[model samples]
Target: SPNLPPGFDFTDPAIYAERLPVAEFAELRSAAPIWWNGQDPGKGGGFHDGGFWAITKLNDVKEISRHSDVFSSYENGVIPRFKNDIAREDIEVQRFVMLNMDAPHHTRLRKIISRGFTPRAVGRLHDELQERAQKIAAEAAAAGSGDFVEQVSCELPLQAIAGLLGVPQEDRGKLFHWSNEMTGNEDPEYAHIDPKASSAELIGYAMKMAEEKAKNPADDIVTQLIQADIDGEKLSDDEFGFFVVMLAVAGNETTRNSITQGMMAFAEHPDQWELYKKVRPETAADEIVRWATPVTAFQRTALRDYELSGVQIKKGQRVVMFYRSANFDEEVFQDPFTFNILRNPNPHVGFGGTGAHYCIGANLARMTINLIFNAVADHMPDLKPISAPERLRSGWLNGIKHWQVDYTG
Candidate 1:
């Protein structure tokens, strides 16, 4: 039996016009946490055409995320909309991305990639990022009112990753444009932008940068990756290109949305914002991520038949772990809906579930949030929303496309 209510299709973008169907999600979590959804005729191709098993509960999502051998990230790639949105051939190319690769290959690549994102390495970037965050906040304050997504949320992550990748400051806008095309392909706003073409351009740019860095090594991730060696293993040019695109897109979108959504959450819960101002608790960052859960769900394919929560999942089936739903699991969190800035024991999988595939940029993301929120609280004490948040029309990312706000302090 289909667990979804009538006219409620998780695959459809229209369902997320305002926000996620939290009430319906609560219903499913209570009734059928591991329900099998039938393929919707309204949606065509790929995972939408072939029904999937939705994993709603926190423990179930973590269990599947941890056991990559049983639930394969390589077989079909991380995102389920690939073959449907992009060409079938592009799916194979996407498999080369670290998010889509499995053990052995993924393990080796992650080892080298992890060098740039270690907590110590990320910590070294703090002063520089704090300076940038303060500047960004001051500019927003000067404007008094503007689109929060563009002026505030979007700038920090783009600059952070662009500078980290050694992309010239002037060329950072290209990263934003290309990322939107690649990640927001399903959204009508990007209909004019060809996803494949954007990807090719990004890869081309990365390859060009790779060539330059290969000769005259710099003090950036590109140079570091070019020379990264793990026991006689090194990244190839093609692999380097894929890595750049993945880091650029993922690094920007996830943190950007987290900031935007975090602000929205803060606006809704003034008491929590007051608590944030009073005490800059470490847990505030975790609470924000829990509230946003920017990257909603990651799809893994079943390598072999598996029994999860007493439900039989066949081989070659798609199992989607909804991180947003898991973040709000009633069994795990006390008053899960309440946005508590000082909420401790917040084991939200905002980065991802506990495993090898966890986000390498998790520390960087946390620091960025911490620095930016500090700036916002200091500079925009009277921050207020001027209009409703215009959410991005997509099934993948939880994005706020536009949100007008005033920060006249």
Candidate 2:
């Protein structure tokens, strides 16, 4: 058979219980850069029945990411497979979101959304976000010790996205609940919550908000989404709802995990933390993203038979790009394991690799990471992790549920 580790199926959440299997990825990259990973029948999640082509090398994933025409996100969907069984109606509703679309359709929706996330627009929020980050850091520092996720990681991103989308402060808790249900369904903690039920509830709320924005607009992304028109085409309420859910979920979850993981890395590497306090280089932000790599892998289906790195992939086969592995590829990054805050020329795919589907919120996310880390270092110089991170039990999102830290300013 292939050069496989015993019971080394990547789909199994238990495989990543302690941490990402970095050594296995290294072995596979050398022996099977395009290895076919079979789903473990013993596993409960609805992984692909037959198998999938796991791309481990850095260059191959960039190649696949750029060629969306041949490697389609819309064919099956970006996610490998849903954990909870979803209805056909819900699947169709999901396809309306930009993340699940290919070329022309993706182009149109992205054009409209781009108006709200332009660098200038995102920059406008930086001052306010910076102020909020300082307050958040001060709170964590004063606590001396608490769950880092609850005190530091989750607060800023949640408030930022809510403000961006014009969501009322009172309703932010609903976004948090729905986002947790949507992404964390496979984890036993959230297994009782039906993903579809939470999605429908979020959609219902978005539809109500969309109607309100339609009648009376405001200065936020929701109003922009409602008013956006191109050649007489407009977003329907269903489409609008899907867009809102995507934003409310994507905007916070990925960012919170990034900050949590970044803090963990800093606590582990005190030298880097010292360097960060002295210079506060922006490369530190990129380094944290590279190290954290919160979103692990995203899958795409082949539109036609293609050859990549001497491996043949048949049409309609699932090809998953493991960003967690790619970020640590030794060939692309020198001293890949080292946590060097000053590391320049970083090309990590913590956000999606370069393509039509590259993260629209990347600038905003980068800004948030910088602000949070800077504020924390300034206000809580003695911050350190007191307990190991309780990792989220899912292969898709590299997340942390809880991590205690001592941070006395």
Candidate 3:
């Protein structure tokens, strides 16, 4: 029951609700490496801006990602025109996130933020990582069988991101709540007012944190932000708050969902769990990122006409890199559909293609998930799912909302 083309629709969340459209993507790979979706499927329920060219090839996606100047992330925004009712004023704050910035600006902000994620810095967190993993895994285990998404997976990165951002130990839950509402805007469970409202709420909270960190600087991201200046442009309250939202929400969601999906994969293929026990699951985390492809797609506006995949793309035309599809490209990945934990040279665009927008937390995410998976597998070698997963209904975030699992007792 995979979707097929002549009838592919990225805007249809239901298609994803059923499953990742691997068959449909395989169809596109053969006939249309640079296919165009004529109209926004309005995954936001009737919102449309314009059509976009979908880039499906691994090489093509990397080429475009490499030249971010040609395909700007700042135009319109990385997210396609799907959600119509996003607050206008809130756009100001959202625009401040490095995800929404273009070169020079993006490079600068990325510089300031990248300070915390350097190899040495992340390596220092091994103690923090192992300690946090124990409590979170133990909590989920104590529940007999609970939603791993909420109880275990989400909490891992939620706590880890909080630590990176220098959020106080007791206050990470509040940050998690704000991030949950901000990213899960489509899910009625969290979308109280709108994404904007939650974003605004997060901004207010971040400003307060920034204020506190200002007076009492620590060795965390907020303190670093409060201390350092970016080129000649210091981060504004608005910008810093939004950046916090990006790290807090996106930082958690990407790893959280992928871990869920990876566990699902391991549950289905128990042999892979055995494989991990023999070698190292940490080595397989990259493959998990490829297999899960938590971030579905990101949009870019063309600066000018550019011929891609034999198609002449016009100026100002929106182009989307469908990462999930590219990850499954048979040309690049051998036996692309099969789940192999030992997939080497897994050149996937899971963390945005390597460029201006490549995910800054890529190393940290891999480290966190690797440790969490290792700890879980160690504690309960026979861990298995107890119920069906409740997947998130968003074209943007490839997520599993609530997947229950039984680790022990």
Candidate 4:
């Protein structure tokens, strides 16, 4: 059996949650790009107790994503070593959405919703998104400095997604709160120890919203989802609820985190920030995704026993695809650690995730970031960090929970 490397512990969620300080994982990547993460005996398993492998290198991450048959998303458990009747029930009632499904079924649902989220479609919301971002940035500028995560980054995406989905703008804060509670377990400020109860409450809210949308259709994503038809069969009430959770959480969390993390990356590399102010800020979007890699990683279960990077993986074993580690792989990226905005042909896996499960919202996310970042560069010229940045606790998502920054023109 291959031995686990130093500085690696499977039981500690803290090690996996912190985003920017992933040096230990990076070192492990260099040593054994695809290593077994010893299971926790405390959690009822040893490292190999459940039989799984962690894919850390960029090339391997791409390989696993490319071979969907070999690595399936639809498995016994999408998450690792944390499944039971209660967990399954919660997932079915709350967070289970298109992300958990594999091809054919996943593809059909995605196609119906893709038209509304296409780059072209999402681009239509740019003017409104920019206006909202400018308003928030202007407010932040006036305040001298404030918590960028809550005040700027998080707010912008919430408003943008709400507007796109046609959710009442006044109720935008509700969506934000629900999304935060859903994904914020990693941050003490955001964690809900009683996730089951919190999730049930959220489901109730989603059900009410879906019912309203069904009876009275509106110009929003929820309405569109409710009205959408595939093969003459409409999405069921439960499916509608799941869709709402997906869009609310995915659209809100990923974009919000990217913005907060992007700003944090800029703080670490002021020269890059200065360059963006002088040149094109749109270029910074790519760098930010590459630098922050907003999504830490997503899980893919092996559909069949597969051989990867000279290691054999058995079917049903959970393979953790480390996007953060891949974004910095030396073999694929030159000087991978350096935050260079000018890097072309980036082929960054941060967005174009390489297979059937590729991000349907890639264009939408990029456009939103571009519009907001460009607007900020043009308006808030003196933006700078005011306090130590806080990170989300979940290993699944990389984002700043509290980022205080100063902005002035």
C-alpha-based local distance difference test score of model 2: 0.84
Best by lDDT: 1
User: What is the lDDT, from 0 to 100, of the residue 104 in candidate 3?
Assistant: 83
Would you list the clashing residue pairs of candidate 2? none
For this target, which candidate reaches the highest TM-score against the unseen true structure? 1
- For candidate 3, lDDT tens digit of each residue in 1-409? 3335444567456666657777667777887778777654333333344567878888888988988878888775777533445554544445677898897888888888887889998999888898888778777777777777888788778888888888887988887777777666666566455666677787887888888988988888888876768666678876777788888877667899889998888888888888986776455888889989998888787898988878898888888888998998888889877888878877888997797778888888888888888777766667878888887767667888888778772
Candidate 3: list runs displaced more than 4 Å: 1-8, 40-49, 87-93, 231-233
Q: Which parts of model 4 are misplaced by more than 4 Å?
A: 1-7, 16-21, 42-51, 80-88, 91-95, 191-193
**Residue by residue across 242-302, what tens digits does model 2's lDDT show?**
8988998897689999999888888888888888889989888788888998888888889
Clashing pairs in 1: none
TM-score for each predicted model, relative to the true structure: 0.96, 0.95, 0.93, 0.91
- Which portions of model 2 show Cα errors greater than 4 Å? 1-3, 40-49, 84-92
Q: How many backbone clashes does candidate 2 have?
A: 0
Candidate 1 residue runs with Cα over 4 Å from true position = 1-3, 41-45, 82-85, 230-234
Worst 10 residues of 4 by lDDT: 40-49
lDDT of 4 by residue, 1-409 (tens): 2344543543244654554446756766768778777554444121234445777787888888888767777664344433222344554343347777777787888788777876667767778877887788777777787788777787777887787776788888887787777766545775445555555566677777778887998777778887888799988866776777778887788887888877777778888889977887556677778887877777777888888889998877778877777888788888988889888767788863588778877777777787777767867877877788777666567767787777862
| Residue 73 lDDT in candidate 1 | 90
TM-score of 1: 0.96
